[PDB]
Amino acid sequence: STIEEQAKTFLDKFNHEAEDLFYQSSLASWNYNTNITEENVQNMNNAGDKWSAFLKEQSTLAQMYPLQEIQNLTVKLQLQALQQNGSSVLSEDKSKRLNTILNTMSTIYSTGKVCNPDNPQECLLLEPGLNEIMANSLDYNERLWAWESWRSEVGKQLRPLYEEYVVLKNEMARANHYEDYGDYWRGDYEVNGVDGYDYSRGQLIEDVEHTFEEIKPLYEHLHAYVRAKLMNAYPSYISPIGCLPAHLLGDMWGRFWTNLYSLTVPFGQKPNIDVTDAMVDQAWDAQRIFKEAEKFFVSVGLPNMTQGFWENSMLTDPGNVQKAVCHPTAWDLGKGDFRILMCTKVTMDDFLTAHHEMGHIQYDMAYAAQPFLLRNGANEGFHEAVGEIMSLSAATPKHLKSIGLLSPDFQEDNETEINFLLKQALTIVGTLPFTYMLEKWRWMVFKGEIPKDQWMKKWWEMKREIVGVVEPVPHDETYCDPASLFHVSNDYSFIRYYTRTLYQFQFQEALCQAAKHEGPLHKCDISNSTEAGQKLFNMLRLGKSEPWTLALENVVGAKNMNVRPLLNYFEPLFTWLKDQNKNSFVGWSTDWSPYA
Amino acid sequence: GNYNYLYRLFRKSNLKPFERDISTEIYQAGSTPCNGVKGFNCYFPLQSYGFQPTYGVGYQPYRVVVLSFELLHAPATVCGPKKSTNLVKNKCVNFNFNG
Ligand SMILES: *[C@@H]1O[C@H](CO)[C@@H](O)[C@H](O)[C@H]1NC(C)=O
Ligand SMILES: *[C@@H]1O[C@H](CO)[C@@H](O)[C@H](O)[C@H]1NC(C)=O
Ligand SMILES: *[C@@H]1O[C@H](CO)[C@@H](O)[C@H](O)[C@H]1NC(C)=O
Ligand SMILES: *[C@@H]1O[C@H](CO)[C@@H](O)[C@H](O)[C@H]1NC(C)=O
Ligand SMILES: *[C@@H]1O[C@H](CO)[C@@H](O)[C@H](O)[C@H]1NC(C)=O
Ligand SMILES: *[C@@H]1O[C@H](CO)[C@@H](O)[C@H](O)[C@H]1NC(C)=O
Please list every residue in chain B whose beta carbon sits closer than 8 Å to the beta carbon of residue A338.
56
What is the chain A residue with the closest CA to B31? A1
Q: Do B56 and A13 touch (CB under 8 A)?
A: no
Q: Determine contact, residues A366/A538, Cβ cutoff 8 Å.
A: no
Beta bridge partners of B46: B8
Q: Are strands B46-48 and B6-8 parallel, antiparallel or unpaired?
A: antiparallel
What is the chain B residue with the closest CA to A20? B50
Q: Is A395 helix (H, G, I), strand (E, B) or coil?
A: coil
Q: Ligand 4 centroid to A555 CA: how many Å?
A: 28
What is the chain B residue with the closest CA to A336? B56
Q: Are strands A244-245 and A469-470 parallel, antiparallel or unpaired?
A: parallel
Q: What's this structure's resolution in Å?
A: 2.6
Beta bridge partners of B6: B48
Burial (0-12, 13-18, 19+ Cβ within 10 Å), A201: middle
Backbone angles phi, psi at A19, to 5 degrees: -55, -45
Alpha-carbon separation of residue A292 from A60, A196, A256, A284 (angstroms): 47, 42, 29, 10
Q: Ligand 2 centroid to A544 CA: how many Å?
A: 14
Q: Cα distance from B86 to chain A (closest Cα, Å)?
A: 49
SS3 content of chain A, % helix, strand, coil (to 5): 60, 5, 35
Query: For chain B, how big is the Rg over CA atoms in Å?
Result: 26
B32 touches chain A (CB under 8 A): no
Q: Determine contact, residues A228/A235, Cβ cutoff 8 Å.
A: no
Residue of the nearest CA to atom 10 in ligand 3?
A85
- Residue of B52, B57, B60, B62 to mutate for A, most A C-beta atoms under 10 A: B52
Around ligand 1, the residues with Cβ closer than 6 Å are A 35, 37, 322
What's the CA angle centered on A316, arms A313 and A322, to 5 degrees? 95
Number of Cβ atoms within 10 Å of the Cβ of A422: 25
Longest dimension (CA), chain A: 79
Q: Determine contact, residues A382/A503, Cβ cutoff 8 Å.
A: yes
Q: What are the residues of chain A with a beta carbon less than 8 Å away from any beta carbon of chain B?
A: 1, 5-6, 9-10, 12-13, 16-17, 20, 23-24, 27, 61, 64, 306-308, 311-312, 333, 335-338
Distance between CA A441 and CA A179 in Å, rounded? Answer: 16
With the most atoms of ligand 5 within 8 angstroms of its CB, the residue from A414, A422, A573, A574 to mutate is A414
Distance between CA A333 and CA A21 in Å, rounded? Answer: 10
B43 touches chain A (CB under 8 A): yes
Q: Determine contact, residues A17/B1, Cβ cutoff 8 Å.
A: no
For the annotated catalytic residues of A, the residue numbers are 357, 487
- Which residues, in sequence order, are CB contacts of A354 under 8 Å at separation 6+? A286, A289, A290, A293, A328, A340, A342, A344
With the most atoms of ligand 4 within 8 angstroms of its CB, the residue from A304, A309, A362 to mutate is A304
Residue of the nearest CA to atom 1 in ligand 5?
A414
Q: Determine contact, residues A462/A440, Cβ cutoff 8 Å.
A: yes
Q: Cα distance from B30 to chain A (closest Cα, Å)?
A: 5
What's the CA angle centered on A304, arms A292 and A401, to 5 degrees? 25
Cβ density class A70-98: b for 16+ within 10 Å, e for less? beeebbbbbbbebbeeebeebeeebbeeb
CA atoms within 13 A on the CB side of A15: 19
Number of Cβ atoms within 10 Å of the Cβ of A444: 17
Q: Ligand 3 centroid to B31 CA: how many Å?
A: 24
B41 touches chain A (CB under 8 A): yes
Around ligand 4, the residues with Cβ closer than 6 Å are A 304-305, 307, 310
- Residue of A8, A21, A22, A335 to mutate for B, most B C-beta atoms under 10 A: A335
Q: Cα distance from A366 to chain B (closest Cα, Å)?
A: 14
Phi-psi region for residue A70, left (φ > 0), alpha (ψ -120 to 50) or beta?
beta
Tally: H helices and E strands in chain A: 23, 4
Q: Are strands A337-341 and B6-8 parallel, antiparallel or unpaired?
A: unpaired
* Amino acid residing at A214: E
Segments of A310-363 assigned E as strands: 329-334, 337-341
Q: Determine contact, residues A199/A562, Cβ cutoff 8 Å.
A: no
Q: Determine contact, residues A182/A494, Cβ cutoff 8 Å.
A: no
Longest dimension (CA), chain B: 86
